[PDB]
Ligand binder design. Sequence first.
Ligand SMILES: [Zn+2]
Length: 647
Amino acid sequence: FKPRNYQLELALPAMKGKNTIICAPTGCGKTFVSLLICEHHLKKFPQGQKGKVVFFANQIPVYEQQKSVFSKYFERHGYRVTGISGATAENVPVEQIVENNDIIILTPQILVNNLKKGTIPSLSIFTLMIFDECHNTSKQHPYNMIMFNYLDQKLGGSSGPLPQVIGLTASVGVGDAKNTDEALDYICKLCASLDASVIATVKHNLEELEQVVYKPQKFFRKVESRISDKFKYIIAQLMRDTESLAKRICKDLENLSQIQNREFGTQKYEQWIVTVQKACMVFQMPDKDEESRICKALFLYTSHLRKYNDALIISEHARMKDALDYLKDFFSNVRAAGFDEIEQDLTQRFEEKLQELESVSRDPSNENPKLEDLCFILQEEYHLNPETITILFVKTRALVDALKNWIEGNPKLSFLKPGILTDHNILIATSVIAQCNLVILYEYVIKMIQTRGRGRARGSKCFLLTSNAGVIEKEQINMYKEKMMNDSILRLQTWDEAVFREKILHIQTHEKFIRDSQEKPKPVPDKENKKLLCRKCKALACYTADVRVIEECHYTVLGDAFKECFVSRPHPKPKQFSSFEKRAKIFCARQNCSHDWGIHVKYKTFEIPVIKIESFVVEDIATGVQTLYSKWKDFHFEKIPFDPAEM
RNA sequence: GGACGUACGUUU
RNA sequence: CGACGUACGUCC
Ligand SMILES: [Zn+2]
């Protein structure tokens, strides 16, 4: 409630009436700077005129937090504060909200959708655009699209009452720059994309930030992996047998994906599996039934190989028993789907191998040395200080649960309590305040950024465990980049204003140039009637003449004959988006297919099965080729809009 | 469902 | 120096 020199020096360049790239690591500091700038902006206007400051929050939690803070602050001043979110902008006059409010905190995607539709034609209605975590303004972000619209309206020659573009962040960032030249070039490009000539950074009151800055210390621990990999050897033999028995129907399986040699349990092998799957999903045997059987068998074999590769990665990273548990869970989930010859062979082979796999996994001599040293350093820190709440960063959503199960089943430790955030001593998270003075990045590659919210100094460690010193060197150069970016900011604060502005202007110019150069024309709409087939079944789903478009993004089918071609399933997490209500999922209605086709929702009153071309193959009736797309934007055809007059 | 970003990996 | 695959996170 009382502004200090630290909170005032960052806002001093912003009160003069110029854009800024204010960089404050303190979470409370950013909110206080927001409030002070908003007060000084709405108070400096004379009678008759009024501000329309807009705050762009990226996430819903920080959005609601800023909304509550602004509504609690600007109450006695006589200012109307509101909010527009994803669950609040449904059939609501956003134009009337903007015209009757002054401190709207609408998220950026809402403003992008409004600019695309036609509501709020010019941004000149606003007067002060305060972004949150502005360093995301890089490419195709909602922030970047709002800035593209602003720069277009500015350089177009109709620059009216343009709003201020004061941005707030914690780290300006470097990206892929190598030397100070490319670092300064990237920072200048960001400053031009956000249209500012000042970067507010503390230089005279560094002690106020050093008091609470949350600067931890790194303790990189390069450790080795297992040696006697009996589990990995058995899984590799199983995968070799599976590939050998799968090559009986496709003699040219090796000629479909030509990259390099492949090894089981690698991301390269996973990519090769996905590529050979997408290559075997386009077969054109004229039988149309044996072809479907061969495609289904190849899809099942490839899915089994992918699951085995995922199990090998889980065995390499987390405990050995967790990989066997994941394989048993996958086999139990596929057992309750269908029983054909392919499943009756694969599941029976896995059951034959499980009698040895369980005996190998239950051996205490095959424990991961990475998990061993992890529990070692954990118990070390815990008996050194028994009041250290920790956070453990994991890469995979399966490993973040495997480590929780390991901690729950580890006899060497009992004080730990799993606090998974995909009565809580350890918080095993995957990707992200004022607490948790211990971080353990377990094979997870800035990603430990905690200086965006509330923080506290006086004790913080940033242990990093890994198996490849590569990653170590990576983090090293990362710290290097941190330093160099600091230096670059210093240089910018040493630069003059006018020339700087001129430079950034030229930058924006070139940018717009590139933009107008990268403007694809309308795709030539195909006039033929191509049909879509299932991925793992190759069954006739629907013709492109019965496909309708809702909002240039969603695709449905109006064919009543299609209504019996799928089955419904209760959605694991129903939620609303824009104008839809996610009610259920639609899967393939075949013997043992159960392929994920799409999602059954309700648009306004009508029930529609919104499908995804990703889970579809395109076969033309004129030519005969079977092309395979990923996104609807890549599929070019007669995109007929959704006409509610028909159904 | 669609868009966006990040990380890893493969390639002309 | 562009596309591609995966994982993660966000948004509408
Ligand atoms: Zn099917």
